[PDB]
Amino acid sequence: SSRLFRTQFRMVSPKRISNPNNTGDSRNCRAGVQINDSGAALGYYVSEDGYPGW
Amino acid sequence: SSRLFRTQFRMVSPKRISNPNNTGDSRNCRAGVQINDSGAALGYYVSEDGYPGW
Amino acid sequence: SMYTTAQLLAANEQKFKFDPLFLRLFFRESYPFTTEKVYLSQIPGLVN
C-alpha cells in the first residue's frame, strides 16, 4: 500500500484461537494461548477461516 | 526487567494456600498458615496449581 | 550410666536411578475422567 499510514487492524473472532491440530492442553499451551513460566502470554495459535466443511 | 521500577505484584487465590500434602492440622500450623507463639502469623504455605496433571 | 562419647560426621540417603523418559516424551497431555469407561475410536481412511 502507498497511503500515508500503512498500519491496519483485523478483528479476529475468539472461536478461531485453538490448539494446533485440535490436540489436548499441555502445560505451556492452554486453549491455543502460549504461557511462559509465569502466567503471562507469549504467543497465540490461530486457525484458518474455513467456511466450507472440507 | 529493565524498566525503572522492578516491583511486581500478584493475586493468589485462597484455594492455593493450604496445609502441605494435606497433612493433618496442628497447633502452630493451622490450615496452611503458620502461627508463632502469640497469635501473629509468620509464613504461608502456598502450592502451585496445574489443572491437568504433571 | 554410659561414659562413651560420640560424634556423627555424615549421613547419606542412597537412592536408585529413576527417570520417567517414556512419560516425559510421548504422553504429554492428560485427560481426567469422571465417568466409568473411556472410548477410543478409529476410522479406516481408505478411498478408492
Curated annotation (Swiss-Prot), chains A, B:
Proteolytically cleaved by the viral protease during capsid maturation. Transmembrane segments: none annotated. It comes from the Viruses. It is found in: Virion. Homododecamer. Interacts with the terminase complex composed of two small and one large terminase subunits. Belongs to the siphoviridae portal protein family. Forms the portal vertex of the capsid. This portal plays critical roles in head assembly, genome packaging, neck/tail attachment, and genome ejection. The portal protein multimerizes as a single ring-shaped homododecamer arranged around a central channel. Binds to the terminase subunits to form the packaging machine. This is Portal protein B. It comes from Escherichia phage lambda. The chain holds residues 161 to 214 of 533 of the full protein.
Curated annotation (Swiss-Prot), chain C:
Signal peptide: none annotated. This is Major capsid protein. Assembles to form an icosahedral capsid with a T=7 symmetry. The icosahedral capsid is about 60 nm in diameter and composed of 415 major capsid proteins. The assembly is primed by the interaction between capsid assembly protease and portal dodecamer, and major capsid proteins assemble cooperatively to form the procapsid with the help of capsid scaffolding protein. Major capsid protein forms hexons and pentons of the icosahedron. Viral genomic DNA is packaged into the procapsid through the portal vertex. Belongs to the lambda phage major capsid protein family. It comes from Escherichia phage lambda. It comes from the Viruses. Homomultimer. Interacts with FI protein. The chain holds residues 2 to 49 of 341 of the full protein. It is found in: Virion; Host cytoplasm.
